[PDB]
Write a protein that binds this ligand. Structure first.
Ligand SMILES: [Mg+2]
Ligand SMILES: [Mg+2]
Ligand SMILES: [Mg+2]
Ligand SMILES: [Mg+2]
Ligand SMILES: [Mg+2]
Ligand SMILES: [Mg+2]
Ligand SMILES: [Mg+2]
Ligand SMILES: [Mg+2]
Ligand SMILES: [Mg+2]
Ligand SMILES: [Mg+2]
Ligand SMILES: [Mg+2]
Ligand SMILES: [Mg+2]
Ligand SMILES: [Mg+2]
Ligand SMILES: [Mg+2]
Ligand SMILES: [Mg+2]
Ligand SMILES: [Mg+2]
Ligand SMILES: [Mg+2]
Ligand SMILES: [Mg+2]
Ligand SMILES: [Mg+2]
Ligand SMILES: [Mg+2]
Ligand SMILES: [Mg+2]
Ligand SMILES: [Mg+2]
Ligand SMILES: [Mg+2]
Ligand SMILES: [Mg+2]
Ligand SMILES: [Mg+2]
Ligand SMILES: [Mg+2]
Ligand SMILES: [Mg+2]
Ligand SMILES: [Mg+2]
Ligand SMILES: [Mg+2]
Ligand SMILES: [Mg+2]
Ligand SMILES: [Mg+2]
Ligand SMILES: [Mg+2]
Ligand SMILES: [Mg+2]
Ligand SMILES: [Mg+2]
Ligand SMILES: [Mg+2]
Ligand SMILES: [Mg+2]
Ligand SMILES: [Mg+2]
Ligand SMILES: [Zn+2]
Lengths: 23, 84, 69, 69, 181, 117
RNA sequence: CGCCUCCUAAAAGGUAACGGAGGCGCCCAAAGGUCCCCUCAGGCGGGACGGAAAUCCGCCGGAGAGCGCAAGGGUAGAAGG
RNA sequence: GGCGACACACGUGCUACAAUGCCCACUACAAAGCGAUGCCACCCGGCAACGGGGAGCUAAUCGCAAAAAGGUGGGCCCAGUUCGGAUUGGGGUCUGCAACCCGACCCCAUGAAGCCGGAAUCGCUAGUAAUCGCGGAUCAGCCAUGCCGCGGUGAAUACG
RNA sequence: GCCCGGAUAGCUCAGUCGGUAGAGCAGGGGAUUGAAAAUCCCCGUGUCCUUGGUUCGAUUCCGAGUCCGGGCACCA
């Protein structure tokens, strides 16, 4: 679901972080 | 959009040209090149000439246009249509 | 009027959302409702609910007079 | 000589087995102030028609000018 | 008849307000509601599922009154329209039931319209009567979601003894007809 | 048309049932089941009119949704159009707004390919 | 090539030409009997989708509508619905 | 200002069309490189982008650093959906003189096409294909889904 | 001039006795070729000759015109 920035999966793909992938 | 940390951006070689008229004598033709300039509250009601790579475009300014630049009101590519 | 074919209208009880009670008549003698006339934003003065937005656009934008002269 | 500028096409395409033949040219032609001469503008953009096929596409417009309609 | 809220409001609160405003010299000269007539303009009942007594339960529940069918006056090509074709339901409301419908029309339904910016302050007959056009029918209190099969709006004709728009305006106003502008 | 202007799909959880409304995404379905205090793993059908009205008043009052949100959206677009800026010009024609390329692709802002002879 | 309608036909009837124009060789079990009840086209204003024209409300409208089909006569104080 | 145009046509790719699937939380196992106006621990602030601090390291020292798929349990139950993430609205974060043309990133709302693709046609013979993530060159930033490298899990078939 | 018939897609022709029209070829998109044919997958599309009329509606039914094909103009 990698074009989905609204998720872990999609934020890993783009290699970023946020509320949706917290570090 | 820019980072609010900094103050909004205006070339300062134009805003001097926005304010000097308000107290000297409003107004004549302001021929600019700074398409990058946020539209200031003090510009409103004025006529300024935004360049588009060849031609100085007349842009009269209203209280519904301010946040956007001077470049949004002078497109550079001239298109018309296709296959007409 | 004509028998057999008309929905019988009876003493009815419409309860709205804002706790509003109306005492009209109907074909269903108790009825429950979303929004109405003692609550709808157009009916109670000027409740813009959330959005007195308004013409904040534009130059309320100020922020600020932060350019030298 | 003519009495109103026109824009026309010339499609010489004969493809039916290798044999060849493709020659395509669209032009504008207008009447000059009399006494002028023959004016020829290579307003071809890029190589849409290759450089080599332009000497002999004047020599074809030029040749067929020897006899008016 | 029977005691009903919007009627009491007409007689003991709406009348005298008017009587002031326009200075009528006679108790009959003073605006009354003549009748209210609802009409599903319809025609989706042409060559398609012709029988829609479904709509006529929709009205039926709204008004407490079963509507009459309107048949096609003249045949028409471009509307897929054969003369004699049922192309609309129509119901004529007077007296108590007019009051009752109008009662719930204003206390409930027009609010229950999405995007309700208020009734058109221009829809006036030129001779004292007024018209509003509705877009669907869940709008009304007794019409639910698990009953609908389609979205049939309707026309509403509010017909009145006023001789001028001015007087008509005042009347409907006083009863609480929301006038956008 | 219970909450808000659109009735919600029973049998399916509420934290998505409220996403089945224009203007309300999963993070807003997130914050409204903690602020009106209803368990998110209960269906629309296993409610009481208590939970319903707490939800309906809360949801409807806080933000703006449905036609009104739409109203302001297109209005925002309309003003952008009216001036009229680049950001609005590309609403006039039907070409991308956010600075795209269109030589190929762009088939959503443009739709069905108008194949040309 | 028979039959119908109008004109020619000279204000009764009738009246010709390879004179001017059109129609008929059907139809309808209701499109018949009778009782009862309704009145049109069109114009303007009003009204969701709905448009020149669908259906709805108002005002004006003596007949210009309708009368299965040509035309003519007739016709709402009905022959119309 | 343009090389980012858009009626259109082709190439190579990414991401999908779901249940051997997708989300949320808990817990594991890589390599190869990179890093002194560079890498940034941990602490706090904000849902976050990031910002204010601030320890250590010219680095088999400190770091970038979680690898991901997977394993444990729970949630959705075949729906254009808790598949899909395009497009659009508003608000933000950093680079940089400046983000309109024309930047990446975050969050809020939007939740399109796409139900496995005509004719045609590519790759692959084993740690290969397939799938999963990491690094670097370039570089202020990044339009990388590109490129060159890294390891994780790990097939099928070859009569002829 | 008289009699019959015909005008429907770029071309050559089906069809309609009333509502939304077809074939072959040419033309357009793509596949195939080093390339051009040939082949393969998709394509569309006409105010159905002009005019007047009957119909709610006409390519269609009725009158007329035009151009075209056929035939006849004899005793003289
Ligand atoms: Mg995948
Ligand atoms: Mg100042
Ligand atoms: Mg040869
Ligand atoms: Mg009016
Ligand atoms: Mg009146
Ligand atoms: Mg939603
Ligand atoms: Mg006589
Ligand atoms: Mg006699
Ligand atoms: Mg005679
Ligand atoms: Mg009869
Ligand atoms: Mg009779
Ligand atoms: Mg009878
Ligand atoms: Mg009339
Ligand atoms: Mg009208
Ligand atoms: Mg309709
Ligand atoms: Mg008559
Ligand atoms: Mg006839
Ligand atoms: Mg440039
Ligand atoms: Mg380029
Ligand atoms: Mg393609
Ligand atoms: Mg790519
Ligand atoms: Mg959907
Ligand atoms: Mg689909
Ligand atoms: Mg999703
Ligand atoms: Mg934006
Ligand atoms: Mg920029
Ligand atoms: Mg989804
Ligand atoms: Mg499926
Ligand atoms: Mg698949
Ligand atoms: Mg396949
Ligand atoms: Mg080999
Ligand atoms: Mg990488
Ligand atoms: Mg981009
Ligand atoms: Mg032909
Ligand atoms: Mg036709
Ligand atoms: Mg005709
Ligand atoms: Mg002889
Ligand atoms: Zn209420």
């Amino acid at each position: 679901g990698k074009g989905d920035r609204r998720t872990r999966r999609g934020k890993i793909w783009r290699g970023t972080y946020g509320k949706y992938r917290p570090r | 959009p820019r980072s609010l940390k900094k103050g909004v951006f205006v070339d300062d070689h134009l805003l001097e040209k926005v304010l000097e008229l308000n107290a000297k004598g409003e107004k004549r033709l302001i021929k600019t090149w700074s398409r990058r300039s946020t539209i200031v509250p003090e510009m409103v009601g004025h006529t300024i000439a935004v360049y588009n790579g060849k031609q100085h475009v007349p842009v009269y300014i209203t209280e519904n246009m301010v946040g956007h630049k001077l470049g949004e009101f002078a497109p550079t590519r001239t298109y018309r249509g296709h296959g007409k | 009027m004509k028998e057999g074919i008309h929905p019988k209208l009876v003493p009815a009880r419409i309860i709205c959302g804002c706790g509003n009670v109306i005492e009209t008549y109907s074909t269903k003698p108790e009825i429950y409702v979303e929004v109405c006339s003692k609550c709808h934003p157009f009916y109670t003065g000027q409740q813009r609910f959330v959005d007195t937005e308004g013409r904040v656009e534009r130059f309320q934008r100020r922020y600020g007079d932060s350019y030298r002269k | 000589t003519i009495t109103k500028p026109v824009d026309v096409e010339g499609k010489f395409i004969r493809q039916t087995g290798g044999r060849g033949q493709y020659g395509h040219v669209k032009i504008k032609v207008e009447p000059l102030p009399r006494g002028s001469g023959f004016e020829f503008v290579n307003a071809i953009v890029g190589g849409v028609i290759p450089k080599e096929y332009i000497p002999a596409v004047q020599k074809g417009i030029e040749e067929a000018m020897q006899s008016g309609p | 008849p029977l005691d009903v809220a919007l009627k009491r409001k007409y007689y003991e609160e709406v009348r005298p307000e008017l009587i002031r405003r326009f200075g009528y010299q006679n108790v009959w000269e003073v605006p009354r509601l003549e009748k209210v007539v609802i009409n599903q303009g319809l025609g989706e009942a042409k060559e398609d599922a012709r029988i829609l007594e479904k709509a006529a339960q929709e009205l039926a529940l709204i008004t407490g009154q079963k509507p009459a069918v309107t048949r096609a006056k003249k045949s028409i090509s471009n509307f897929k329209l054969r003369k004699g074709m049922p192309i609309g339901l129509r119901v004529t409301l007077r007296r108590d039931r007019m009051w009752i419908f109008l009662e719930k029309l204003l206390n409930v339904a027009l609010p229950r319209i999405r995007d309700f910016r208020g009734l058109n302050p221009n829809s006036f007959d030129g001779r004292g009567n007024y018209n509003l056009g509705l877009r669907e029918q869940l709008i009304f209190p007794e019409i639910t979601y698990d009953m609908v099969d389609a979205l049939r709006g309707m026309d509403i004709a509010v017909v009145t003894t006023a001789e001028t728009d001015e007087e008509a305006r005042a009347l409907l106003e006083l009863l609480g007809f929301p006038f956008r502008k | 048309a219970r909450i808000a202007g659109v009735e919600i799909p029973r049998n399916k959880r509420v934290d998505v049932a409220l996403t089945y409304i224009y203007g309300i995404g999963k993070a807003r379905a997130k914050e409204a089941l903690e602020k009106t205090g209803i368990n998110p793993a209960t269906r629309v059908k296993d409610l009481t009119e208590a939970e319903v009205v707490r939800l309906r008043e809360y949801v409807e009052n806080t933000w703006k949704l449905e036609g009104e949100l739409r109203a302001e959206v297109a209005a925002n677009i309309k003003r952008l159009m009216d001036i009229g800026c680049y950001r609005g010009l590309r609403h006039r024609r039907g070409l991308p707004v956010r600075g795209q390329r269109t030589r190929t692709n762009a088939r959503t802002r443009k739709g069905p390919r108008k194949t040309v002879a």
